[PDB]
Amino acid sequence: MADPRDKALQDYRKKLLEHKEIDGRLKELREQLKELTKQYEKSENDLKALQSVGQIVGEVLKQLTEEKFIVKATNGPRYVVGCRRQL
Amino acid sequence: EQDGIGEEVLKMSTEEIIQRTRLLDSEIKIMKSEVLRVTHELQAMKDKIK
């Protein structure tokens, strides 16, 4: 007759081994989530960045009226243009 | 691990029969639910990032 102490110790060892295996699976999933969180952050940053446009850079040459500016775009064509209200 | 060995040796019936089994069952069920949820979220977010 196997001693109850031996049975309890064997059951505890088996449960600990199963818990260690499950912990290894959890650690693998956690590493996957950690990598994929930064990967998804970069992916969403790129996707948001894709929808955005550039601003022509040009030099203001004179301020005609309170909301009229003459701007000489770097290529050379001169425009009369407005101005954003909070500036 | 010494504390666990002592608990399992000195207390063979008062702990293994009731305390250990229920705690282990609760832990494994919680971990399985967490694994399933994490796998579902990972698959959904993998499809989203695809």
Description:
It is classed as immune system. Chain A has 87 residues and is α+β, with helices and mostly antiparallel strands. Chain A has one helix spanning 4-50; strands at residues 58-63, 69-73, 78-81. Chain A has 1 helix and 3 strands. In chain A, strand 2 and strand 3 (78-81) form a beta hairpin. The longest helix of chain A is centred in the N-terminal third of the chain and has 47 residues, at 4-50. By secondary structure, chain B is mostly helical.
Q: Shape of chain B, please?
A: elongated
Spatial strand arrangement across the major sheet of chain A: 1-2-3
**How much β-strand is present in the residues of chain A?**
15-25%
**How many strand segments of chain A?**
3
Compute the number of helices of chain B. 2
Pair with the most extensive interface? Answer: A-B, 19 and 21 residues
Family (chain B): Belongs to the AAA ATPase family.
Organism (chain B): Homo sapiens
Subcellular location (chain B): Cytoplasm; Nucleus
Protein name (chain B): 26S proteasome regulatory subunit 6A
